Amino acid sequence: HLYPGEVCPGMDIRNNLTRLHELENCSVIEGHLQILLMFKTRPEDFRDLSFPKLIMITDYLLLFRVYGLESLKDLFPNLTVIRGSRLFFNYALVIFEMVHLKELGLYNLMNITRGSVRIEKNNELCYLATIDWSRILDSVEDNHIVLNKDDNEECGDICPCPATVINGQFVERCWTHSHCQKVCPTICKSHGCTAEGLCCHSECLGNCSQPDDPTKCVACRNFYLDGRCVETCPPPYYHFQDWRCVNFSFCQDLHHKCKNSRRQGCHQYVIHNNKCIPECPSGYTMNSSNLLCTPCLGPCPKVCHLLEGEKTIDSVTSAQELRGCTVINGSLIINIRGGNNLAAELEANLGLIEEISGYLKIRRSYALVSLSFFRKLRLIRGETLEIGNYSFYALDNQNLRQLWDWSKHNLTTTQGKLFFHYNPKLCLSEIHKMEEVSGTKGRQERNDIALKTNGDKASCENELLKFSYIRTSFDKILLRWEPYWPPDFRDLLGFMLFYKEAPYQNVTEFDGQDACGSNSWTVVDIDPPLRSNDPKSQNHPGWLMRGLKPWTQYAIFVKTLVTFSDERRTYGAKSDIIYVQTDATNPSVPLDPISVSNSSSQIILKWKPPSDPNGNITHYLVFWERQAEDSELFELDYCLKGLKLPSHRPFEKVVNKESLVISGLRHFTGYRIELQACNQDTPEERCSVAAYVSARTMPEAKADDIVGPVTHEIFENNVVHLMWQEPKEPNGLIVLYEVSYRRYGDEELHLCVSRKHFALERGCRLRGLSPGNYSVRIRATSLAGNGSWTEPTYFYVTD
Amino acid sequence: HLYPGEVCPGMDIRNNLTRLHELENCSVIEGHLQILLMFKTRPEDFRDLSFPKLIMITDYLLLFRVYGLESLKDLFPNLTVIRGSRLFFNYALVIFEMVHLKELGLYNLMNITRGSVRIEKNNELCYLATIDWSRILDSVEDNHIVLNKDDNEECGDICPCPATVINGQFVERCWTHSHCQKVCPTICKSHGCTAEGLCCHSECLGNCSQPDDPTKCVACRNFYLDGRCVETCPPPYYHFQDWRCVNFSFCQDLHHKCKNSRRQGCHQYVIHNNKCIPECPSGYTMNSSNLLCTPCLGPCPKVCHLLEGEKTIDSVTSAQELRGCTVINGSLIINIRGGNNLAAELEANLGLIEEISGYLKIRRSYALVSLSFFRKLRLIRGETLEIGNYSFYALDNQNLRQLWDWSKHNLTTTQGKLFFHYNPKLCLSEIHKMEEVSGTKGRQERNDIALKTNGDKASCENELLKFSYIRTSFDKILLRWEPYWPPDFRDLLGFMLFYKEAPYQNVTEFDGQDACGSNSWTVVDIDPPLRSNDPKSQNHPGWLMRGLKPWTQYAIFVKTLVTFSDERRTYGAKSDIIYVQTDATNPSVPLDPISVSNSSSQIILKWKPPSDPNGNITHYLVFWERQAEDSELFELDYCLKHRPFEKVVNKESLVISGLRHFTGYRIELQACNQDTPEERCSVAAYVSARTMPEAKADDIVGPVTHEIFENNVVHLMWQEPKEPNGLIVLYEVSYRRYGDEELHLCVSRKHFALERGCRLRGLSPGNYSVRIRATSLAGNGSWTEPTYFYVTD
DNA sequence: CAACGCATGAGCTAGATCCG
DNA sequence: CAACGCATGAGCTAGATCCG
C-alpha cells in the first residue's frame, strides 16, 4: 500500500519510556515528535523496542538529552521523509548533546522538504561528513554541524555506494559501517527511483516497488487519496494539512469537537478555497451552517464566547484576554477595589465592545467616575438575570458622577431591572435620563432604585451660567460672565475656571477626575466679587487668562462653589462649555535653506517649512544680493607662497512650493540669500526675520583664458617687452599671469608678473635674454584656478 | 532744636493728593515715602503746598509717574539727608518717568549714606551734569543717569561756588538757576560745615547753626538723644532703628501692640545687645517676661500661634503656611477629599510639629496611608474640646488601617473623648493599642467608639508565618516558609511576596491603604501549593527571586490571601518582615586611569574607585610591563622632513619610582576583595605613558678620530651612545674653519650604520674644528669636543 | 455717553470695566 | 539517607525539594 497504517497525533515524551507505547500501529505523525530529558535510563532497554511502520513526519523531529541510545536505527528503521511543515527554532531536525550515541543510523531519509539540519555537542559520533546533504537537503546554506567528535579527524571513517565527487575530492559517503547512502542516476531529480536505476512514477518520492505506477510506491508529493495521489484532487474533497484531501463530512466534526471549549490547541475549522483551514483570515468571517467564510463587509465581529457564564474584571490582565472581542455571550461584573488608574487603559483593552447577553453589575468601585470607557455599547440582551430578575446593578460606589453622554449615545436593555443603591455621588436626574433612553419605563420593584441613599452626599446643580463678553488677542483671552448669588448671599466661596486646549470638538464634560490619572483640567480659582446692592453695577466678575500659545482653539467653563451644611438648597450653578480660538501673530523663522550650484547660471535653493506657523501661511518672501570681491587681494605678490581658491534688490513672491531656482545672473559671483516666512498679507503684512545664507555660482570655462594679439618689442639691451590683452570678465579676478618662454632644446622656463606689475607696465619684460629662437607662452591664472595656455609666440633674436 | 518735630511712619500715596495732609507736623519719616500714579492732577495744584519741617529719611524716596510737578523745591524745602537703610530696587532715590519736571530743585541734599541715585526717561530735565555727585555720595560707580533731555547737549546750561575740576574740565556745579551746590573746604569731610568755613561739631552733618557744639547743629551721625547725640549712648537706653536710642518702656509697648496680631507688618521686638531688634536670630529665642533672647540650647521651638482657633488642611498649600512650626496654639482639622499623592510631601511640610493644644479631627479621609507624617507628636493638651467634650475624632474614613507604630512612638492625651466611627478598614485591636498608650483608659461615653462600623470590610489578621530556610547566591535568593491552611482548605487564593531593597532598618511597614505611590513594594503572586494530606510532606511552598544586584540588603515578607465571605473567620495570616543580604561577587573595573610623567624616572599614576564595588574592596593589584621600542623607525632616513607587582592597600594613589629611566611602560590595575578562599579579581584597565630625557647618557664621549684619504674626503670615526634615551636618530655633526661658522652636516641611523662613521667631500684645506652633538628622538643632547685637524694646501 | 490717552502688560508698583 | 551528577540557569523545553 501507500500508507496502510494509522494516523497519529503529535506527542511528547519526558522522564520515561512509558508513553512511547502508543506508537504501536500509527504510521503518519502529524505535528511533531519531541523526546527529551530521560536520565535514569539504562542503554539495555532500547535493543528490543522498535517502530517498523513509521514513515511520514510533518513538522520536525527533536532528540534532546537522551542517555542510553547508541544507534537510533533500531528505533526508526523506515522513516523516509520529513515534510517540515512547521519549523522548530529555524531548524527541521535537531540531534543535540547526545552522550552515548555511537552512530546515527538515519539511512533511509530521501527528501527534506523545507529547512535545514543541526547537530551540535556530540563527542561520540563519527561518519558525519559522509552524508552528502546536498542530495537530500535542497538548502545547504543553513547547515550547522560544529563541535563534535569529528572536530578532529580521529574516528576511523571506514565503510564499504558511488564515492561522489561533489567537492574536488573522491569523498566516500556512508551512513554506517554496514550501509551507504543510496544514489541512483539523476535523470529524475526527486521522482522516486529503484535499485536498478529505473525511475518510478513522476508524482512520488523515495523508496519504490514498481516503476511508473502511482499506486504502489511509498511517499508521494502533493496530497494523498486512498492509495492514489494527484497534484490537485477534485472537489468532492478539500485539502487538509497540505498532505491530504478529505470529504467535508470529516472535518466538520472537528469543528464540533472543540466547539466544546475544552482544549485551546485545536482551531474552529472553516472551509476556504478547498482548504479546511484553522482560520479564514482577516477580511473574512465564518457563516453558521455552511462552514464557509463570508467576505466581511466592514468590520465583522469575531464573537467571544465567555467562559463559565460569568466573569469578574478586577485588573488589567483579567481584561487583557478581552481585547478585540466585540460580542460577549455571557455576563460581566466590574469591581475595581481601589486601583490607581484604569481610566486610560480600558479604552485600549475593552473600548470596542458592543454586545453582551447577561447582566452588568458594578459594585465596590472606588476610582471610577464615569463609564466613558464603554465606548460602543448599544444593547444588552439580559438573557440571564441576577436574583430578583436584575439586569443592571450599582451598589456602594463612591465616585460615579456620570454614566454616559445621552446627547450622543444610545443604549437599550431588553428585560430585567435596574439597581441603584448607596451611590451617593450621582444625581437623581441622570438615572431618570437613563430610564428614558432605555427600554424600561414603569418596570419598578417598589422598592426599586434607592431615591435617598444616592446623590445625598453630592450637591447636583440645576442652574446655568452664560457669558457676557469674550475678547481675543495674540496671547490673552478675556472672560466675563453674568453675575450670580445664592438665595443666601453670604454662603459663597467663589468660582473655579477650568480650561484646556482642544484640537477637536469631541471634548468631554467635567468627568470628575479625582483619583490618579492623566491630564486633568487645569484650573485657577476666583475671589468672589463685591456686593453692590445695585441691579446695574460692576457685579460681572472677570478674570484674565494669560499664558496661551497663539492660534489654538481653547475650551472653557466656570463652576460655582458653596459650603456644605444641613440645608438641601444653594446647589450652585454650572455654566455650559464653549469654544474660543485665540488670534495669530508674526510667524517663526524658516528652517534650513540649502543652496546647491550646478551650472554657472542656475542656482537652486530649497528650505524647510517653519517650526511655528501661527496660522495658515500665505506665501514666502525671498531676497538676494550680488556680493563683491575682496579689494585687498589686488596687491599681493602671488609668486610669494600662498594662492587662493574659492568655491532695490530683486525678488519674487514664491507661493505654494518649497524650492526655487534663479537664472540670469553673474558668473562665479557670491550671493547673499535671505528668505522670509510670512502669513496673510494684505491686512497686517507681518513677516519674521530672514534666515541668511551665502552662495557662489559655478565659474565659466573660457572666462579665465584670454585670446588676443601677443605682440613683442625688442629693446637695445636685449630686454624684450611683451604686450597683450587682459581677460575682460575673469572668473572672480585674474591674479597672476604664468608668463613662460622656451628656447628650442631648452625647457619651458617661467617668470612672474604681478597684478599691479601688469598694471604699471601694461605687460612684462625679460631681462638678460640669451640670443636664440624663443617661444613665449602665457597662462592666465585667475583666482578660480589656472586658465589655458596661449599660442607659443615665436621670435628669434640673433648674435 | 536738633530735631524739634514729630516722628512719622512711612506712607504710600496713590491716585490722589489728599493723603499728604497727614504729614503736616512730622519731621522724621522712618520707613520710606513713595508717591506714585496720579493722573487727574493739574500742574497748578502744587504751588500752594509745602512741608517746611522735613529732615530725615531712613529708607528711600520714590517719585514715579507724577503728572503736574515741575520743581521739587516747592514741596521739600529743607530735605537734607537720606539714610538708605533699605534700598528700593537696589537704589536709594529714584525720580522716574516724570512728565513736567523742568528743573530738579533738591538743593539741600548733603550726604547719601548708602546706595546710589537713578534718574531715567525724563526728557524735560536740565543741569543734570552740574551736581558733583562725588561730593554727596560715597559711591558713584553704580550711578545710572541715561536717556534724559541731556542725551543731547541742548538745554542751555547757564548758571551763576567753585566750579570744581574733579574731571579734566572746569565744570560748573549747580542745582538751579538761582542756587548752586555748596562746597566748603575739606578740612573735615562730613563733619558739618558753615558758610564761613568753620567746621562744626565732629558728630554731625549737613547744615549747622553754631560750630563745635553737639546741641545746635541739624543732622547728626550715629544716634540721637534729646537734642544731643553721642556715638554710643549708655545703657539706660537701647539703640533703635540704627538712628535712635530709647528706654525699655518704649518698645515693650510695641511688642504688646503686636501681640494683638492685627497686621503682618509686625516685628515681635526683642531686646538683644542694647538693640530692640525685630528678631533675635537663629540660635536664639525670646524669654517672655524679661524680653531678652536666650542662647537656645538645641533646636528651640519658634512657636506658631494659629489663627482663629482652628484650621482645615486639604491641599499642599494650606499646610505650606505652617512649615517650620513645632507647637501649634490651637486645634487642627484635616480633610483630604481625594487628592492624588500627598503622603510624600507632609513630612517635607509638617513633619516637624510636636505639640497641639486643641483637638485633632479627621473626617472624610479618602486617600491617606497612616499618621506617620506626624513624626514628633508626643502630647495633645485638649484645652479646647469638640462637641460632647471630644479630643480625638476619626469619622467616615473609608481607607484607614494604621494609626502609628507604638513600638517606636510615644503619645499622650490629657483630657477629652476619642471618636472612631465608620472607619471600616481599621482593626478594633489597634484602637485598644491606642487606648493603652494614651492617657485615658476607661473614659467611655456609651456610645463610645464604634465597634461595628470599623473593621468589618477588612479582615485584620491574628496569625503569623515563620520562615524555614533561606539560601543566598551572588544574584539569587531562595525563600521557603512553613505551610498554612485555613479552617476550610478549599477557600484559599495563594500568597503575595512583597520585597524592596533597604539600606537601613527604619523601614515602613505595609499598611494596606491606596495612595498613589511612586515607590511601592513590588510584588509577585504565588500559586497555592498542592494538598498532600500529610504532616511530613513537601507542603512548604517556595519561590525564587532573581533580578537583584549583588551585595545589597533586601527586605521581604509574605501575606496570605482569601476570598471575602459572610462568616467572620479565615482572616488569613501575616508573616513578620526580616532582612536578607545578597552575597558579593567579582567587582567591576576601576575608573579614570591617569598617569603623569614629571621626570625621566618618576611616574605618578592616579585612578578612581570603581562604579560597582560589590562589597568592601580589600586591596588592589597593579602590573607594569616594559613596553618595547617601535622598530619601524629603524629604516627612516632622518635627514628628511614575571611582571613585577605589589599589593597596594588602603589608598587611592600610587607612584612607581626606582626603575629604569626613559622606557615606555604599559601598566594595568585590578580591584579585588579577599583572596585565599574564592580568589575573585576583576578585569584590568590599561594605561600608557612616556617619560623625559636624561642629561649625560644621550651624549656620547669618545675620541672623534679622522682618517685622511687622498681625494680630499676625510673619513670620520667616533662611537655611538651605548645607552641613549631610547634611540639615537641624528648626530648633529659639524665642522668649523677659522673665520667660518660651525657649518653643520647630518647623518641618519643607517648611514652611520652602513659606514661606521662619516665623511666630508670636497673640503677646503685648513685647520677645521669638528664637533658632534647627539640629537636623539627625544630631543638634543650635549656636544663632544671640537676636534682640531689641519690638512695643508 | 458710550479704543485711547493723560503707563506699561506679569522684569520691592496696580494687574486689563484696574481709570474716565 | 540525608552539593553533585547522569543539564542548563529565564537566550517554540522544565523553572531550583524541578530529579534522586
Q: Tell me the CATH number at B330.
A: 3.80.20.20
All three cell numbers of A530: 463685591
Task: State the amino acid at position A449 in one-letter form.
Answer: I
Distance CA B123, CA B621 (A): 78
- The CA-based dihedral angle spanning residues B19, B25, B28, B29, taken in that order and rounded to the nearest 10 degrees: -10
Pair (B432, B471) in one structural domain? no
All three cell numbers of B290: 524679661
All three cell numbers of B557: 515578607
For A395, phi then psi, to 5°, come to: -150, 125
Contact yes or no for B613/B587 (Cβ under 8 A)? yes
- Of all helices (H) and strands (E), which one includes residue A591? strand A591-597
Distance CA A479, CA A468 (A): 8
- Strands B61-66 and B93-96: what pairing? parallel
Q: Is A270 exposed, middle or buried (0-12, 13-18, 19+ CB in 10 A)?
A: buried
For B624, phi then psi, to 5°, come to: -115, 155
Pair (A415, A327) in one structural domain? yes
- Strands B33-38 and B12-14: what pairing? parallel
Q: How far is the CA of A521 from the C1' of C14 (A)?
A: 30
Q: How far is CA A232 from CA A58, A188, A219, A551, B162, in A?
A: 19, 21, 16, 66, 125
Q: How far is CA B739 from the centre of its chain?
A: 74
Task: State the amino acid at position A665 in one-letter form.
Answer: L
Interface A-B: count of C-beta contacts within 8 A: 14
Contact yes or no for B754/B688 (Cβ under 8 A)? no
* B398 at interface of A, judged by CB pairs closer than 8 A: yes
* A522 at interface of B, judged by CB pairs closer than 8 A: no
Task: Find cell 545746635 and name the residue.
Answer: B216
* Closest C1' nucleotide to B543's CA: D16
Task: Find cell 634611540 and name the residue.
Answer: B727
**What sign for the dihedral angle of Cα B152, B153, B156, B162?**
positive
Three-state SS at B74: helix
Distance CA B652, CA B632 (A): 38
Q: Which residue does chain A place closest to B340, by CA atoms?
A: A516
- Strands B117-120 and B93-96: what pairing? parallel
Task: Find cell 502609628 and name the residue.
Answer: B404
Distance CA A300, CA A325 (A): 11
Distance CA B83, CA B206 (A): 13
Distance CA A524, CA A479 (A): 13
Q: Terminal CA-to-CA distance of chain B, rounded, Å?
A: 116
Pair (B425, B357) in one structural domain? yes
Closest CA to A121 of A145, A143, A89: A145
Helices (H), A427-552: 428-437
All three cell numbers of B145: 543717569
Closest CA to A704 of A748, A666, A735, A665: A735
* Closest C1' nucleotide to A88's CA: D12
Distance CA B52, CA B75 (A): 8
Give the 3-state secondary structure of B562-631: CCCCCCCCCCCCECCCEEEECCCCCCCCCEEEEEEECCCCCEEEEEECCCCCCCCCCEEEEEEEECCCCH
All three cell numbers of B405: 507604630
Distance CA B608, CA B473 (A): 28
For A467, phi then psi, to 5°, come to: -85, 170
**Which residue range is the domain that position B277 belongs to?**
238-295
Pair (A243, A332) in one structural domain? no
For B430, phi then psi, to 5°, come to: -70, -35
Pair (B494, B372) in one structural domain? no
Closest CA to A396 of B422, B83, B518, B664: B422
For A456, phi then psi, to 5°, come to: -80, -35
Distance CA A211, CA A199 (A): 6
Give, as ranges, the nucleotides of chain C with any atom within 7 Å of a protein CB.
Answer: 6-7, 10, 12-18
Distance CA B261, CA B304 (A): 12
Q: How far is CA A652 from CA A655, A662, A670, B41, B161, in A?
A: 9, 10, 20, 56, 69
* Closest C1' nucleotide to B530's CA: D17
Pair (B325, B283) in one structural domain? no
Task: Determine the longest span between alpha carbons in chain B, in angstroms.
Answer: 142
Q: How far is the CA of B65 from the C1' of C13 (A)?
A: 11
B16 preceded by a cis bond (ω within 30 of 0):
no
DSSP label at residue B254: H
Contact yes or no for B157/B184 (Cβ under 8 A)? no
The CATH number given to whatever domain includes residue A268 is: 2.10.220.10
* Closest C1' nucleotide to A540's CA: C17
Tell me the HSE value of A295 on the side-chain side, using a 13 A CA sphere. Answer: 1
Q: How far is the CA of A684 from the C1' of C19 (A)?
A: 30
Closest CA to A219 of A232, A200, A201, A206: A206
Pair (B375, B253) in one structural domain? no
Chain B residues with CB-CB distance to A363 below 8 A: none
Distance CA B183, CA B192 (A): 11
Q: Which residues contact B212 (CB under 8 A, 6 or more apart)?
A: B198, B199, B200, B201
Q: How far is CA A570 from the centre of its chain?
A: 55
Contact yes or no for B759/B718 (Cβ under 8 A)? no
Distance CA B10, CA B28 (A): 10
Angle at A367 between CA A363 and CA A372, to 5 degrees: 85
Distance CA A162, CA A744 (A): 81
Task: Find cell 513630612 and name the residue.
Answer: B347
Tell me the HSE value of A127 on the side-chain side, using a 13 A CA sphere. Answer: 23
Closest CA to B776 of B752, B742, B741: B752
All three cell numbers of A174: 556512508
* Method underlying the structure: cryo-EM
Contact yes or no for A511/A369 (Cβ under 8 A)? yes
Task: Find cell 575573585 and name the residue.
Answer: B680
All three cell numbers of B118: 537713578
Helices (H), B304-453: 343-350, 428-437
Q: With a 7 Å cutoff on the CB, does A91 touch strand D?
A: no
Distance CA A339, CA A515 (A): 9
Pair (A471, A576) in one structural domain? yes
- Strands B477-481 and B467-472: what pairing? antiparallel
DSSP A215-274: SS-SB-SS--BTTB--SS--TTSEEETTTEEE-HHHHHHHHHHSSS-S-TTS---EEETT
R_g over Cα of chain A: 47
Distance CA A28, CA A219 (A): 11
Q: With a 7 Å cutoff on the CB, does B433 touch strand D?
A: no
Q: Is B760 exposed, middle or buried (0-12, 13-18, 19+ CB in 10 A)?
A: middle
- Of all helices (H) and strands (E), which one includes residue A570? none
Distance CA B46, CA B67 (A): 11
CB contact under 8 A, B338 and A514: yes
Distance CA B627, CA B607 (A): 21
Closest CA to B406 of B438, B428, B367, B359: B438
R_g over Cα of chain B: 46
B287 preceded by a cis bond (ω within 30 of 0):
no
Chain A residues with CB-CB distance to B564 below 8 A: none
Distance CA B591, CA B568 (A): 61
DSSP label at residue B764: P
All three cell numbers of B703: 675620541
Closest CA to A710 of A781, A778, A787, A798: A778
Residues 381-420 of B near strand C (Cβ < 7 Å)? none
* Closest C1' nucleotide to B65's CA: C7
Task: Determine the longest span between alpha carbons in chain A, in angstroms.
Answer: 144
Residues 36-65 of A near strand D (Cβ < 7 Å)? 36-37, 39-40, 65
Contact yes or no for A58/A30 (Cβ under 8 A)? yes
Q: Which residues contact A503 (CB under 8 A, 6 or more apart)?
A: A553
Q: Which residues contact A64 (CB under 8 A, 6 or more apart)?
A: A34, A35, A36, A37, A94, A96, A97
Tell me the HSE value of B659 on the side-chain side, using a 13 A CA sphere. Answer: 18
Beta strands in B454-577 (DSSP E): 467-472, 477-481, 494-501, 522-526, 542-545, 553-561
All three cell numbers of B289: 517676661
Tell me the HSE value of A451 on the side-chain side, using a 13 A CA sphere. Answer: 6
Distance CA A121, CA A150 (A): 11
All three cell numbers of A469: 463678553
All three cell numbers of B219: 543732622
**What sign for the dihedral angle of Cα A627, A632, A637, A640?**
negative
Helices (H), B656-781: 749-755
Q: How far is CA A270 from the centre of its chain?
A: 31
Contact yes or no for A246/A238 (Cβ under 8 A)? yes
Q: Which residue does chain B place closest to A396, by CA atoms?
A: B398
Q: How far is CA A225 from CA A2, A25, A83, A184, in A?
A: 10, 20, 17, 28
Pair (B412, B316) in one structural domain? yes
Distance CA A753, CA B355 (A): 100
Distance CA A475, CA A459 (A): 36
Give how far A339 is from chain B: nearest CA, Å. Answer: 7
Q: Which residues contact A609 (CB under 8 A, 6 or more apart)?
A: A590, A591, A658
Beta strands in A720-771 (DSSP E): 720-723, 734-743, 749-750, 764-766
Region at A5 (left for phi over 0; alpha for psi -120 to 50; beta for the rest): beta
Closest CA to A374 of A395, A401, A355, A393: A355
Pair (B373, B432) in one structural domain? yes
Closest CA to A424 of A459, A460, A461, A454: A454
Contact yes or no for B227/B2 (Cβ under 8 A)? yes
Distance CA A461, CA A479 (A): 22
All three cell numbers of B89: 530696587
Contact yes or no for B680/B639 (Cβ under 8 A)? no
Beta strands in B53-174 (DSSP E): 56-57, 61-66, 81-82, 93-96, 117-120, 144-146
Distance CA B460, CA B574 (A): 10
Q: How far is the CA of B545 from the C1' of D10 (A)?
A: 11
Q: Which residues contact B339 (CB under 8 A, 6 or more apart)?
A: B315, B366, B367
Distance CA B262, CA B255 (A): 12
CB under 8 A, 24+ apart: contacts of A271-276: A271/A238, A274/A235, A274/A237, A274/A238, A274/A239, A274/A245, A275/A238, A275/A239, A275/A240, A276/A238, A276/A239, A276/A240, A276/A246, A276/A248, A276/A251
Task: Find cell 511533531 and name the residue.
Answer: A32
Give, as ranges, the nucleotides of chain D with any atom within 7 Å of a protein CB.
Answer: 6-7, 10, 12-13, 15-18
Chain A residues with CB-CB distance to B338 below 8 A: 514-515
Pair (B481, B527) in one structural domain? yes
The CATH number given to whatever domain includes residue A547 is: 2.60.40.10
Q: With a 7 Å cutoff on the CB, does A90 touch strand D?
A: yes
Pair (B376, B332) in one structural domain? yes
- The CA-based dihedral angle spanning residues A471, A477, A482, A486, taken in that order and rounded to the nearest 10 degrees: 180
Q: Which residue does chain B place closest to A515, by CA atoms?
A: B340
All three cell numbers of B120: 531715567
Tell me the HSE value of B583 on the side-chain side, using a 13 A CA sphere. Answer: 14
Distance CA B87, CA B58 (A): 10
- Of all helices (H) and strands (E), which one includes residue B252? helix B248-259
Angle at B272 between CA B268 and CA B273, to 5 degrees: 155
**Gaps in chain A with C–N over 2.5 Å, residue before each:** 160, 647
- Strands B238-240 and B61-66: what pairing? unpaired
For testing the chain A interface, which of B514, B525, B564 should be mutated: the one with the most A CBs within 10 Å? B514
- Of all helices (H) and strands (E), which one includes residue A462? none
Three-state SS at A316: helix
Give how far B343 is from chain A: nearest CA, Å. Answer: 14
Question: Per residue in A316-350, is it b (16+ CB within 10 Å) or e — as a string?
Answer: eeebeebeebbebebbbbbbbebbbebbeebeebb
Distance CA B621, CA B427 (A): 59
